[PDB]
Amino acid sequence: KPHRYRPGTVALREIRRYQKSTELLIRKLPFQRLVREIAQDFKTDLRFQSSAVMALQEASEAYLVALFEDTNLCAIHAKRVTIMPKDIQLARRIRGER
Amino acid sequence: PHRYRPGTVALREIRRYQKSTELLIRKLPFQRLVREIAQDFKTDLRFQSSAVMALQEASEAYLVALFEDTNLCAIHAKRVTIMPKDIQLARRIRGER
Amino acid sequence: RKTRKESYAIYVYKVLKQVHPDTGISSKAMSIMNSFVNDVFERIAGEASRLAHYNKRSTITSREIQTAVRLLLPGELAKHAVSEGTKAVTKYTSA
Amino acid sequence: RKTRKESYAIYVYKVLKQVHPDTGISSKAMSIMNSFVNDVFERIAGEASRLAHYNKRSTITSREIQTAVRLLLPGELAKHAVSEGTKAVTKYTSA
Amino acid sequence: HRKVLRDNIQGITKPAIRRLARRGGVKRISGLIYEETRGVLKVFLENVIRDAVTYTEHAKRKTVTAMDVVYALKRQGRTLYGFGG
Amino acid sequence: HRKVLRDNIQGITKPAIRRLARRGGVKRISGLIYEETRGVLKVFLENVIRDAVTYTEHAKRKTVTAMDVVYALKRQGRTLYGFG
Amino acid sequence: KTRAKAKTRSSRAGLQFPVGRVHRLLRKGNYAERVGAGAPVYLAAVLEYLTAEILELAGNAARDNKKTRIIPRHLQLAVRNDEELNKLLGRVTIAQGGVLPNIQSVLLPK
Amino acid sequence: KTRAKAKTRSSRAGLQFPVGRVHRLLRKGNYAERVGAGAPVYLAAVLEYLTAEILELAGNAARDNKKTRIIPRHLQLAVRNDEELNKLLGRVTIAQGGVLPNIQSVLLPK
DNA sequence: ACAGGATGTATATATCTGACACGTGCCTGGAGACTAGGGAGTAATCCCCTTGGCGGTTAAAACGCGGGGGACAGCGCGTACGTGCGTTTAAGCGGTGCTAGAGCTGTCTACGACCAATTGAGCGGCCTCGGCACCGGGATTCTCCAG
DNA sequence: CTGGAGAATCCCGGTGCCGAGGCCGCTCAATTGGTCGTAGACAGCTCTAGCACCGCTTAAACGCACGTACGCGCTGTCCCCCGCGTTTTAACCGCCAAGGGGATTACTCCCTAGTCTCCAGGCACGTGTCAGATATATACATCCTGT
């Protein structure tokens, strides 16, 4: 007989796993290219220190993670377990970014 | 009978107080509340009138803003009645608690 | 007479008279405007201060002010300010 | 042949040896602690700066530092910090 | 005739809290909100007034001035225009 | 070196977003979130890099340093520890 | 010692705001060891410009409500209706300003 | 002048943090026109104290996981598990710190 | 859908007040010439990191194959608070008076920059070795699924 | 529900490494004695606001009534996102090299503090009248009933 886990078990295992570990979750090179692309519209042919790109990725993941924590609390407050765009919009409005 | 349906007079209050600017808390009770809370730091404190007024200004503006955010949280959850949990969520997301 | 305390009252009035000669202003509004001027002032000076410090320079020049303005004011508001300031700076060096 | 870039590393290590003699610290953690020290330093000095400004005084004394600490640090942290600070200043007046 | 005050927290009456919510755009208010609101406001005031007095003790003054409150507000990132500065 | 980048925003991929959410404590993610997330992140990055480069031009440098990013983060009340 | 006919630095820049006073505030304000000559002119220009920008919108607000003297309410309306200006003063509270009439759509009757 | 031997002001205050270095950073830091003699000693004492609190908590956290070298994750856990430190650092992000394990009750299986 | 009616609200008109626009008096902060130090622009160099750029390994993003719980319309019910009536109750308002501490003024002497001479704490750079990072393999728990 | 199963994670134990602790020049920042300007500490005068305090009007607040909309609990449904197999994609990882720029070292000269002085803008001090703050009576929104 086959062997499949129920929805959410592997999800929680990943939550405990990535919450226990501390490595960066975005892929280095694609993100480094996104940074350079976005930076193009301000000054042409910018060079980047390696640590500056790392600091951006670090700050980006920490910022998004915190936003998801608040988005999660908002979703739970509305008797749901699935985060939706309007939850992110609400979170940013309450915080003061939009 | 001429009893108005629930919310009509409420909306009238909303428009009425949103169109004007006077302060909504009674000056003397609030003034006493300020002095009472201040007691636990220094005895026989004196206040400038403008200070007590500035506290009422700040206080009402802070609460009004909290109710705006709270109200958005309530509406989000498909309700139209603000509840303590909504205020707690607001304060939590703002970083005040 | 007393300890004289200064404010931007007359300047707010002169600007008001250039933009709306037939419009007046209440004492409370003048207070609010004065607080606004002191606020924006302290923010710009603070940022210029940080700019001079981070780059180990001891002089706040028009460049630090400009960069500071670009950091504090959102978008087009900063651009016209930078525009006006540029005019101002240019015209000043010719007078 | 490089340029002297100072830090708080050796002091965090000395304190570390007084509090946990058998515990070490990674490079990145020492960097984080160093940034934390500069952060708290700038905050306290900033509040002391405005405190001095408001009351038109030109000297930052123990009073301003103490009041600034009470303003910035929550509860017991502040209380014990004043205890340690005052004790130390008292001891310093002897020597 | 020195006087020690008690139960002035009840001075932020229920009608006044309703009025505040009305200016905030609130349409319906549960009855349990009012006592909870007094608690919330209390914490806010506790945080602000304490700091105000903290400024007061530094200046060696016996009277809390308006400016003390303004600076207190400034300290918490809630700058207030219209009283001095 | 005359080079230009396009559509690199697709680099922040689906499994990476779901990873970020998992570290944030999210348990279930609607499919519509990804387009929303790339946009949200973009805004954030747009703001920060803009300020970063703004510091860079003031220093008359052609290379964005890590310190520029740190000061940028400080400028928005999102202070970062561990880079100076 | 009869020196030359003086004239304010604001006038040299064609400005209303006091370049000299701002310069004095800068020297005694603990911001930098020294302050450049163009800094006050540039700064005064920016402050005057922002003041004109808000006072103009305020003026329109007062005219629209049939009043000729500006009061706080018009300032609150003036700031909160300009998105960029709103952003600049997003963490500021205006005394006796009230709020903008903004009722969430779902709460209204029909 | 073949003077008395030198003692660090830190040692005079029985402190490990550099009263001398802090004092210099204050004087050249554009904070006030004058810095009182007791200010750096008092400040150094408070910085060393706060340093000891975080290090001490990180130390405990490290020992409780059988590690002798402090790495960022412990600093994160240390700061965020103390209410007053958490309140002091609510807008700060620690690089490579991660997040405190915190799963909302309603999400655990039923 | 569809008028009738009965009440808040903006409209227009009106009367004394005092807030603000303006005059006046007077005062000190802005400017102007001059001086004098030193901060940051300008040139040129070393090297070192930054970036271009090839070859292969393998982790990982991608498609899809189900499928099972999750968001959400809907129905329905029992508190519950809004509206309003009616009644205190106490704040508003004015109206007195005392006085006490803000707030300034005029004394200073104490306390912190200024200077340079000396030298020992801190750093740079460069060592060695020990937790440590990940592999190899068994056990416990953990999650799940059949009786 | 209650044991049987089967794997994911945890534990236990082993090997070269390079990150971290220590050493060794070695350089400049802390210390330390005077030394001096001047900044805030202290005594004391003025008075205005702060606070204690009386009298009445009335508007704000409190207790109730009731009923109608409001939150919230359950039920049923598509759908859609998660788990895993598979595979292509392309990032990692190492690796080579040319080099651009940045992090410096002379070198200056020019740009901004610093002083004194002159006097004109800026601020208190009144002050008078014109917006203005609320009364009196309009049709119309407007909301509800009832059609």
Numbering used by the authors:
A (entry chain A): 37 to 134
B (entry chain E): 38 to 134
C (entry chain D), D (entry chain H): 27 to 121
E (entry chain F): 18 to 102
F (entry chain B): 18 to 101
G (entry chain C), H (entry chain G): 9 to 118
Cite, word for word, the article reporting this structure.
The nucleosome structure is stabilized by electrostatic interactions between the phosphate backbone of the DNA and positively charged residues on histones. Nucleosomes are highly dynamic and can move along the DNA in an uncatalyzed or chromatin remodeling enzyme-driven way. In this work, we solved cryo-electron microscopy (EM) structures with differently organized histone octamers and DNA. Our structures show conformational changes in the histone octamer that are required for DNA translocation and thermally driven nucleosome sliding.
We collected cryo-EM data of nucleosome core particles (NCPs) assembled on a 601 DNA at physiological conditions. We observed that the X-ray structure fits well into the Class 1, but not into the Class 2 structure. We refined the X-ray model of the nucleosome for both Class 1 and Class 2 cryo-EM maps. In both classes, the resolution of the histone octamer is 4.0 Å or better with many side chains resolved. Although in Class 1 and Class LS20 structures we observe only minor movements, the RMSD data show larger rearrangements in the Class 2 structure. In the Class 1 structure, we observed that the H4 tail interacts with the phosphate backbone of DNA at SHL 2.5.
